[PDB]
Amino acid sequence: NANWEHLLSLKRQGDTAKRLRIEQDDTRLGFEVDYDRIIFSAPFRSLQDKTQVITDFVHTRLTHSLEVSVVGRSLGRMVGKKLLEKYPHLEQVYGYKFNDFGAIVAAAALAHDIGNPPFGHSGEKAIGEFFKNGYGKRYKDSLTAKEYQDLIKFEGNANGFKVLSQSKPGAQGGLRLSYATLGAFMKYPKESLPHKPSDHIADKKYGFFQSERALFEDVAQELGLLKRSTTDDVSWSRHPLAYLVEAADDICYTIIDFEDGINLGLIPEEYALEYMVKLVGQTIDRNKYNALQETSDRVSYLRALAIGTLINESVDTFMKYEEEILAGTFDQSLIDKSNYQAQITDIINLSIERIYNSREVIEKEIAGYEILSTLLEARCRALDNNDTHYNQLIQQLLAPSLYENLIQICAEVSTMTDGKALRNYKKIKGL
Amino acid sequence: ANWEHLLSLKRQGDTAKRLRIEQDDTRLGFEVDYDRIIFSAPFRSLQDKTQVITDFVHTRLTHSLEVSVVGRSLGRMVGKKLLEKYPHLEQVYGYKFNDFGAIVAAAALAHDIGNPPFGHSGEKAIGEFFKNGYGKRYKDSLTAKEYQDLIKFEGNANGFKVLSQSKPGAQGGLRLSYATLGAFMKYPKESLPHKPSDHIADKKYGFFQSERALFEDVAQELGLLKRSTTDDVSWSRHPLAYLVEAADDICYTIIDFEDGINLGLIPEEYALEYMVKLVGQTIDRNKYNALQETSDRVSYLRALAIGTLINESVDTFMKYEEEILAGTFDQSLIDKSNYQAQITDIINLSIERIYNSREVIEKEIAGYEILSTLLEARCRALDNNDTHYNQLIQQLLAPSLYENLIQICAEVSTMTDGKALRNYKKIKGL
Ligand SMILES: [Mn+2]
Ligand SMILES: [Mn+2]
């Protein structure tokens, strides 16, 4: 069974001595510094020019990441305060405070989208398609089964972990986030294989590439995560705070996708109160709602309330199943146990029908397949014959072990802004 | 002046006091303020608002987030020292060091939220419209202060308006805590008199006549010191305003320099030359030399210089803490820095190579045309709301005379750079 004293590790990669919570300066608390390191990092700043499914210029992945980190800070503060009541020795002996849990969830949430390719899950699938059926199929017999699985099922979560921890000359350990933050980041503590060994949400995807396996082994050992398999296919039970990072993300994309689609016209405004009345009625001020004269103001009032309702419930679900999560025996997400799962489901379904299957979004994702394939092919052909005049040009333009080279090409194409990607694609194509 | 009152948790419309000891620690009013700004439409609109350069990767949103991060750190470090200097603030009123960081962080997060597009040129295009352009005609129908609001339109005062604008069903706007609004107020003065002293608090003004009564309520709750010797009102800065200003000062000095270097406008060699004193005692030379990319090298130096400037600003603040509390502090915290010469060399280099570059002058020249055109259409429709064309302009751009003109200026100010150009193009047929 896992221990909250080890799960709240302040260790950073390469540390030679232990970091005790009591001995920290509260003005420079490890977990809070993690948040700043992310805000100021080049991968986070690049989210300015990375659009979500809809490209209205005011629907960015930076805003999503920001709002997920805010909701995440709330979730972790409230759970953190209840956990210190249950296990008083964590504050009495180890010096932990409730804002520590707030900070861990907030930093992991803030970073949760940092490694995703452009164009959504279509972007991930364009990359996988490239190595499964495109030019990149040629590498299959030179890679291990799990190196190849990293590629053909390329996963933005796992690319995220690489962005946060990648060593470079003069920058060992990447952003060097606290291990507790890295533990909460990891929604899927498993390798690419075996694929979907169970129906648990933690088994649905994978969380780290082969290139990062040794790194997460260090994190998992320090946190004391529970070994879920020892069959040479490593996987662990989720760090408890990872459920809150997931819940914050789930809450935001459920409610705020709905809001956005109402504002963009894709969802008639009538559905707003219809799908959300159960989630708001115990807290809504009817007088205030009927005075608001603008649709955007009405639906954002409803969204603030729906999000408040879901945070409060998610805290309760965590505390109820707290011992099962600590044992690694909790099989669902926090949101899967919500009493509003009927309402959440109808919301998600309407959002899919009217937004994610809208003609604009389908078009952006189809063009994304072509943009990502073209960039991957220019990179891989340059890797294969670095001697030609053209491939040396391509090398100066796009990038000035075989598996490490391929995964790095994937990481770099994935972290390109939409601006650099399209401009470089157009250049390659003569447009 | 008393830190008990300066740290007020009041929200607009309140009928009873808000005791710090009775706040829920997971719903603290100062931290709620941050989240309200983060989720607000005006803050989201900074996504499509460019700063000096249009690279899509230098937005007013990223600047606002980084100023707020540097402000949280300042508020935090200063807060602990204030609480150790004034222990009754914690043992009696229940304030905590994280409270100062939250106030500074919220005020800093919002500090650019009312700024017009196209930078300081945007502000001057709005003023010229009312001083010598079409808007000149209203001068005889407005008090001196009402007109001065227009001819010297100020992004800072527009930000206060945005944070507090009442609308049906939304009294008080974001309803931020009064301590946060105090921390936001860099220029607690009205548009007149114009630059009374050479003090930075008097270089600009901070609230329009439309918001004068709101800030009067704020200044009274917080117990700010009236420094005005006339009917013209003026207050000494809320002490935390010095930290909000310092966070902004540190970020635009160092990060503009970093941006200019990474963009290509400033040669790389100037990085170490201009920042060696700011980083000499904390830089790891082997780490630096091991960094291969210039971007990563300048990021390292930027993090180091900000670290030095934050520490020095905290020390400066506590050194002059009683003078700031008494409203007798005459400078910015960064004005008192030992690296004033390095800072000035850095600012003057950025001015020469970034702010006067051809690409920035053209954007500003174009910004003038865009803002003047939108202002004239809205004002002509205000004057003759009866014609078919002016009703059309009313539906597209906006679906008491001073109230109407200050509103038109606020709306033109908060338009994204994108909406400004598109609406400008429709008004011109493209
Ligand atoms: Mn997300
Ligand atoms: Mn600024």
Residue A236, strand partner residues: A227
Is B56's Cβ below 8 Å from some Cβ in A? yes
Interface of A with B in 265-294 (CB under 8 A): 288-293
Residue type, position A213, single letter = R
Burial A17-52 (b: 16+ CB within 10 A, else e): eeeebeebebbebbbbbbbbbbbbbebbbbbbbbbb
Resolution (A): 2.3
What phi and psi values does residue A171 have, to the nearest 5 degrees? -150, 70
**Nearest CB neighbour to A63, from listed B44, B97, B299:** B44
Interface test with A, best of B38, B45, B51, B56 (most A CBs within 10 A): B56
Q: Which ligand is nearest to the Cα of residue B120, counting in written order?
A: 2
Residue B189, strand partner residues: B234
Burial B163-188 (b: 16+ CB within 10 A, else e): bbbeeebbebbbbbbbbbbbbbbbbb
Interface of B with A in 404-423 (CB under 8 A): 416, 418
Q: What share of chain B is helix, strand, coil (3-state, %, to 5)?
A: 65, 0, 35
Contacting residues for A152 by C-beta, under 8 A, at least 6 apart = A128, A131, A132
Contact residues on chain A for B305, CB-CB shorter than 8 A: none
CA distance B191 to chain A (A): 32
Is B429's Cβ below 8 Å from some Cβ in A? no
Is A48's Cβ below 8 Å from some Cβ in B? yes
CA distance A194 to chain B (A): 37
CA distance A14 to chain B (A): 15
Cα gap A393→B206, rounded to integer Å: 54
Q: How many CB atoms lie within 10 A of CB B84?
A: 11
Last residue before each break in chain B (C–N > 2.5 Å): 399
Residue A60, strand partner residues: A51
Q: Which ligand is nearest to the Cα of residue A62, counting in written order?
A: 1
Is B23's Cβ below 8 Å from some Cβ in A? no
DSSP string, A280-325: HTTT--HHHHHH--SHHHHHHHHHHHHHHHHHHHHHHHHHHTHHHH
Interface test with B, best of A31, A48, A244 (most B CBs within 10 A): A48
**Nearest CB neighbour to B38, from listed A36, A42, A67:** A67
Residue type, position A310, single letter = L
- Provide the angle, in degrees to the nearest 10, between the axes of the packed helices B358-383 and B388-397: 130
Asked if the bond preceding B193 is cis, omega within 30° of 0, the reply is: yes
Cα gap A131→A127, rounded to integer Å: 7
Contact A78 B26 (CB under 8 A): yes
Does B355 count as an annotated binding residue?
Answer: yes
Q: Which ligand is nearest to the Cα of residue A251, counting in written order?
A: 1
Task: Report long-range pairs for A17-22 (Cβ below 8 Å, ≥24 apart).
Answer: A20/A94, A20/A95, A21/A94, A21/A95, A21/A96, A21/A100, A22/A94, A22/A95
Contact residues on chain B for A27, CB-CB shorter than 8 A: 73, 76-77, 80, 97
Contact A45 B26 (CB under 8 A): no
Contact A57 B76 (CB under 8 A): no
**Nearest CB neighbour to A81, from listed B26, B292, B416:** B26
Question: How far does the centroid of ligand 1 lie from the alpha carbon of residue A66, in Å?
Answer: 10
E-assigned strand segments in A373-420 = none
Contact residues on chain B for A36, CB-CB shorter than 8 A: 69, 73
Annotated binding site of A for Mg(2+): 64, 112-113, 249
Q: Helix or strand or coil: residue A430? A: coil
Q: Helix or strand or coil: residue A60? A: strand
Q: How many CB atoms lie within 10 A of CB A341?
A: 11
Contact B65 A39 (CB under 8 A): yes
Q: How was this structure determined?
A: X-ray
Cα gap A126→A121, rounded to integer Å: 9
Burial A94-129 (b: 16+ CB within 10 A, else e): eebbbbbbbbbbbbbbbbbbbbbbbbbebbbbbbbb
Interface of B with A in 128-167 (CB under 8 A): 167
Contact residues on chain A for B48, CB-CB shorter than 8 A: 57-58
Cα gap A105→A310, rounded to integer Å: 16
Which DSSP symbol is given to B23? S
Residue of A nearest to B81 (CA): A27
Distances (CA, A) of A131 to A401, B268, B400: 17, 39, 66
CA distance B231 to chain A (A): 37
Q: Which ligand is nearest to the Cα of residue B59, counting in written order?
A: 2
Q: Six-digit token pair at A156?
A: 């933005």
Contact residues on chain A for B170, CB-CB shorter than 8 A: 288, 292, 297
Q: Helix or strand or coil: residue B176? A: coil
Q: Six-digit token pair at A222?
A: 């320090």
Q: A184 and A242 in contact (C-beta within 8 Å)?
A: yes
Q: A170 and B288 in contact (C-beta within 8 Å)?
A: yes
Contact residues on chain A for B169, CB-CB shorter than 8 A: 288-293, 297
